[PDB]
Design a protein around this ligand. Structure first.
Ligand SMILES: Nc1ncnc2c1ncn2[C@@H]1O[C@H](COP(=O)(O)OP(=O)(O)OP(=O)(O)O)[C@@H](O)[C@H]1O
Ligand SMILES: Nc1ncnc2c1ncn2[C@@H]1O[C@H](COP(=O)(O)OP(=O)(O)OP(=O)(O)O)[C@@H](O)[C@H]1O
Ligand SMILES: Nc1ncnc2c1ncn2[C@@H]1O[C@H](COP(=O)(O)OP(=O)(O)OP(=O)(O)O)[C@@H](O)[C@H]1O
Ligand SMILES: Nc1ncnc2c1ncn2[C@@H]1O[C@H](COP(=O)(O)OP(=O)(O)OP(=O)(O)O)[C@@H](O)[C@H]1O
Ligand SMILES: Nc1ncnc2c1ncn2[C@@H]1O[C@H](COP(=O)(O)OP(=O)(O)OP(=O)(O)O)[C@@H](O)[C@H]1O
Ligand SMILES: Nc1ncnc2c1ncn2[C@@H]1O[C@H](COP(=O)(O)OP(=O)(O)OP(=O)(O)O)[C@@H](O)[C@H]1O
Ligand SMILES: [Mg+2]
Ligand SMILES: [Mg+2]
Ligand SMILES: [Mg+2]
Ligand SMILES: [Mg+2]
Ligand SMILES: [Mg+2]
Ligand SMILES: [Mg+2]
Lengths: 302, 302, 302, 302, 302, 302
């Protein structure tokens, strides 16, 4: 919805946003939103996500598709009315994104998803990219396990020439929807085939917001290597603009730079990861805050 | 409508447009247009705005959508006939923009929206942009507050990978219509996902005129960095041609240049802002005429 | 129609075209075509112009839209059959442009619209363009007043982020049609949002011929400053070939070059204007035949 | 249709093609095809030409539109069947071009249309283009009169900002069809607005063939000056590939180079024209064979 | 169908493809396929070819179109089922190409079409191209005659601004289907207007395989000069990938290089032709193995 | 499906993936999935693949097209519902790829397809490419025979100007589907006319995953020699990211580099092949683990 501020209420929002990353218990926002989701009336539509066509499919709290649902309208504080209607397996009225209110007045946060190696990590979309020798897929899995902590991470596999990989975009959207409804830490391997359709353009623009609203993290690899003067800027956009956090390989083998948006209008933070390989290419992130500026951010985006 | 002029009536127009920026009481135009919208017969359409598909949706004076409204024609001075008709939630006849008269014969104004720090600010669309180290989001909120003055400012949130951010363009047009129907000072964060569809193209081309006609100011951040021939120049277009005022970061950290169109055929003004951060990234604009010359404008652009 | 010539009838035509610019009383063609229009039967279609979709809307002599009109055919003298039919507001059979013959055998003229400051100006489309510091909007209004002479000039406003500006293309084609039907001197501010749709493309390629056939002048500002490799050339097309005259700013502030097509196959004339501002940015063109070659014209067009 | 040759019948075709340009009485092919046309059964469709949409309209021998015509099939020598059917003013079955056989086995000719100044000129499409100071429009008219000889030439006017100029492509197609059905020498001013739609692409590709088949000449001006890396190669294609003859301005004022395709596989010829202006810009071509090679042809196309 | 091989059966295939070019009697494949087409049950569809819209039209063995033909399925060796169905003049089920089996297990051949001047020539598509002074049209006809030998060659004429030239793409597909159904040696003048539509794209991709399957040769001229990134490289594609043999002009006037694919996986051969003109531009190829090495091929291209 | 991992189950997966390439008996995954397919109910859909339009056609285990199949849903173990329905020959509900689960929890493998000359080869898509003198078609057939071992390999032929080559995309997807259903070793000659439609785009992005899931190998030649700025990069995409292995020609004639993805997140291997020709261009690969880094892989990809 729209929100109204004065100096005092604005200062209160920024303190709340700052807390949401810096001092909240890691993973507490996710537990909170899981509570909101479980308390919705049994058959309420909770999430809509674009399929390849630009149509939207709709899910309930248990990540089952809604196929038919008769018009229902809800009135917000700002006077806005939201109306949801599903017909023949597709949204007739509504919008893409969360169909129930997960946030209230607390918007523009990067809720802390996990702490690891003495650093807090933000929920939302994490793009793992870069150029050079360091392998993206082993890193996404290392980070999934590490931010998972005591919990298992969910793996969505898409668009690679390997066994059991789904290559149909509509199944991909179904996987991702289910992952965000049911798990705090999610890995996507890979965004290669997404980076095209209206659905594909909807996902890139939606997923960070959906994830941050939930308090889950989606850790996605993206090889920028299609080296054409159109796709290569869909990649740099994706990474600059469409991500909550960026994990970029460096000059040095096994070393990665993590750049984090900590919230709306807040400082972007940075830290480095050192990594090494064990048996069967299982990567370990070694374990035992620094602000980055828009000059140094565009510098790393190179 | 069309308007006819001779030397004398043209001189009067120019005097009145001058006044509308320079000597009218700040915010007086907004109050006048608020009174006119309050007096409209209750279920009259007052505003049409383009949705993503290029179709238009229509609102009444309380920012609720009009689903059905039977043909109604009105005759203007110049002889022209304006018609409005809404059917199954969409404009069947009419045009985008204000559907009742707020401006009268007085057209081509940049009505003063507020005065702050010894500077008058125009209503219409303010684009906050630039490259370099200064943060756009903190600035739009600092301006929102400052121009709000005694009044709270409204925040429309769109297309950023953060909690609670809407990413559906149609919800966004809803938010913006409600904002303009109900508040003098409005912030949009951000224009990145708009900068595409027919609706997106419509919005960029319509919003400044809508705002200026109302006497409200829409303050929007625009990241120019997408760096390709299509979008990088669609951004310079937007800032050059589709904006009433421009706020651009400079060489010096925390410093910004404000470039203001004062009305139809009138001179563009310029002034500088100095800023500083307090706690939790809250920005303050320090407070305790200069014309720019069309080639110095092209210099500022880039 | 098609016309047939031998050496003798061609010489006569060229003499008549020459006279239409050089010796006819200024504004006489306008009064002539006003008479032709006034003689047209009361609900007969006289003008069709393209809307955004590329469909055409149709007007009668009093600038009212025709909603329904039964198929009627008319036999021209070359043998051609012209059929007009209007259904549900849109032309179903016919063509864009004048639907009645304003011109006869007297075709390919640039009929003199006015004389000012010792110089004759042509009807048709006048594009006011160039770069540098001289302001286009003040100049189009100054020309408007100056060529209006004893008569008021009409102003069509479109696509600027200022109060009361229409931004809907279809309202815009409605305004221009009414203006050409009812007024000798017309200003458009501005062609910006036009330079896109089929309708936009149709307007650029129709309006100079429509105006010259009427004997009215359409004075339109075009800012070329949008430096896209595509669009920077659509401006030069518009100016080079879609215009009867060009008014371009020079190296010297306040000074403009006027380049005039005097008729079909005839010499293009050039002259300079000196200008100055008074109060509230009201510009005055100072007062008290030079042929220009191609290449010199292309030099100008850079 | 398809034609079968051996060495002997091929040598006979080439001698006939050579004669068709070099020794036939000038304008005799046109008289012959006028005879074929007048001897067709009264209501037979004789010509189909693409309108803007890519649909085709159909004409009879007297250049009147056929609106309804029931399927009729004709068997050629090669066994091919041609079938014509018109429905609701548009061709349902058939092809674009001549619908009656004007040529028989005598195909691939550039039939001589006229002789003037001691040089023979080919029927088909003549594009008058080039860059520099020499005026195209006065030359097209000079050439029309000169090749007209004892006959008047027909002028089709299209897409210029001057009085009485049609700007609707479908009326343009009607004009051109009528011109080729009824006159040996035809001038088009200009191809500017053609050089786009499917119809526009159909015309460029068809008109030379239609004209050569008839034995009429279509003399069309084309300013190449749209200087964009797409339109500018539609122009060079148009001129290189889609023309029977090319008339190109030179280094020297008033001087033109004429380059002629004399027939299928035959030599391209070249000669120069000297010209001067009289009163009211009426141009005279001064009056009282040379082969050109593909190296020198691409050289002139520069 | 698919074919299965082991070492031994693969060796046999390669021997038989070798033979099909090197030791079979010239023209024997054409006679074999002629017998097979003669024996087909009378109204069977034998050939489908793409029209402009991407739809396919279907012919019988006498080159007459099939308007209606009810579903009929046939089972292949590999288990695959081929179906053919024609409805209102268009293929409803089936594929483009030959609709009965002419090649058998022997696939991937360039069957020898003729021998001339001590050189064997392949069936399939021969593209005659190049820059420089040598004329393409005279050469395609000289080759047509020479390869025809005792037989006349067929000429398909398309898209040149000369008398009798068809310019309708659908008539062209008709001509070409008839040519391949009925003659061993075929000339197309020219490919310029094909080099676009779905049908045009289909033809370029299908014709060489159709011809080679039949054992006929299609000799087509292609002017490469259109000089833009889209078409100039679509031409090099056509000549590189879509052609069975290539004939390219050289440095030296009248001299040409012939580059021949001899079959699937076999070596490309090369030889040179010397030529001279007699009367009326009739070209003679003088008569009274060399492999090219893939990089020498890329050298010849350009 | 989605899968959930903690450190322990992830280590197990990576060990299983490692074994699937390095220690499983060559060709065992193929025989395993043959068993899964053989267990499928007699007319159950097992595979869907995109046709040219972007619609999907559907096959049963014996490679027969399914024309009609009533909606049937199946519940996966992650909770996902998979619904299949076929109507009028086309998939109405479902997804592209395998419609039955061939892989289980064992996903992200490059299952070993064969061992030859002391080296293990992976199933999936193998693209044979590069520039220079070494011939791609001979090599794909040599690999076909060599990896077939005791079994015959299947050859799908498409889009070459040679006898019996299918050029219809839809027959081509039919061939590939049948090949993957019935054979472990498959050759495609060639991918040329594929590298366009939605179907072509779908194939490039589906076939490596389909094959690897089956445990078959598709060996496809791709000539990059089409040097368009657009297409030269679609080839590198195809090769970089759409392939399980790459076979590229080197500086040295007859010599090829093999680059093999060994599984999800695992090291890429490299080895060299030496080759020679015998009679009728039959190539022999000579007989009697080196990891490769990124950057070295990009060096190769130039
Ligand atoms: N034991 C190891 N030592 C060093 N590097 C390894 C090891 N195991 C894997 N890698 C690296 O990680 C990569 C595995 O991931 P993958 O093959 O998917 O490549 P990627 O860089 O993730 O991107 P993509 O798959 O999109 O090309 C390998 O290319 C390899 O370079
Ligand atoms: N306390 C602070 N000191 C210095 N800079 C700050 C501080 N707080 C915020 N900023 C700057 O303000 C910006 C926060 O806003 P945001 O993250 O939205 O970036 P932006 O410049 O608005 O552009 P975008 O979001 O489009 O990338 C950051 O770039 C950050 O560097
Ligand atoms: N009093 C004045 N003295 C000098 N120049 C002036 C004066 N008044 C206006 N101008 C010039 O004329 C312009 C007014 O026209 P406008 O603001 O519409 O810009 P423009 O040059 O017409 O182009 P655009 O509107 O497309 O930016 C001013 O921006 C300024 O450049
Ligand atoms: N008396 C004359 N002396 C010299 N040149 C003349 C004379 N009359 C006309 N011309 C030239 O011929 C041109 C008339 O034709 P026109 O104005 O249509 O230009 P064009 O070169 O034909 O092309 P376009 O109209 O498309 O720009 C003039 O521009 C002028 O340069
Ligand atoms: N007697 C001759 N001596 C020398 N050259 C000749 C002779 N006759 C014809 N030619 C050449 O052959 C060509 C005739 O064919 P045509 O006009 O079709 O040209 P082309 O090279 O085939 O290309 P296009 O028609 O695509 O421009 C001319 O270029 C001409 O120079
Ligand atoms: N006996 C041989 N000795 C040396 N090289 C050979 C021999 N036989 C074939 N080749 C090479 O292999 C090629 C056969 O493959 P093909 O003709 O299909 O070309 P390609 O290199 O596979 O690519 P494309 O077909 O796309 O042009 C020959 O053109 C030649 O370059
Ligand atoms: Mg990877
Ligand atoms: Mg921001
Ligand atoms: Mg202006
Ligand atoms: Mg001209
Ligand atoms: Mg030729
Ligand atoms: Mg090959």
């Amino acid at each position: 919805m729209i929100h109204l501020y004065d100096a005092k209420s604005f200062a209160k929002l920024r303190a709340a946003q700052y807390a949401a990353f810096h001092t909240d218990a890691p993973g507490s926002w996710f537990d909170h939103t899981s509570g909101v989701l479980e308390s919705v009336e049994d058959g309420t539509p909770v999430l809509a996500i674009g399929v390849e066509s630009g149509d939207a499919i709709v899910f309930d709290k248990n990540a089952q598709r809604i196929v038919a649902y008769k018009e229902k309208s809800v009135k917000a504080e700002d006077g806005s009315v939201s109306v949801v209607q599903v017909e023949n397996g597709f949204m007739k009225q509504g919008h893409r994104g969360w169909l129930v209110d997960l946030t209230g007045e607390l918007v523009g946060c990067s809720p802390v998803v996990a702490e690891f190696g003495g650093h807090r990590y933000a929920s939302g979309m994490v793009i793992v990219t870069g150029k050079g020798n360091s392998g993206k897929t082993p890193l996404v899995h290392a980070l999934g396990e590490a931010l998972g902590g005591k919990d298992k991470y969910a793996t969505v596999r898409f668009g690679e020439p390997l066994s059991g990989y789904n290559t149909d975009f509509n199944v991909f959207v179904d996987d991702i929807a289910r992952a965000m409804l049911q798990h705090r830490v999610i890995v996507i391997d890979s965004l290669k085939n997404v980076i095209i359709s209206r659905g594909a353009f909807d996902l890139l623009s939606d997923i960070g917001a959906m994830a941050a609203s939930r308090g889950c993290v989606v850790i996605a690899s993206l090889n920028p290597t299609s080296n054409d003067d159109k796709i290569v800027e869909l990649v740099k956009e994706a990474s600059r603009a469409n991500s909550t956090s960026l994990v970029i390989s460096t000059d040095v083998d096994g070393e990665w730079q993590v750049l984090t948006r900590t919230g709306e209008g807040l400082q972007r933070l940075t830290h480095t990861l050192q990594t090494s390989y064990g048996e069967h290419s299982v990567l370990t992130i070694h374990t035992s805050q620094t602000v980055i500026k828009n000059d140094e951010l565009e510098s790393v985006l190179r």
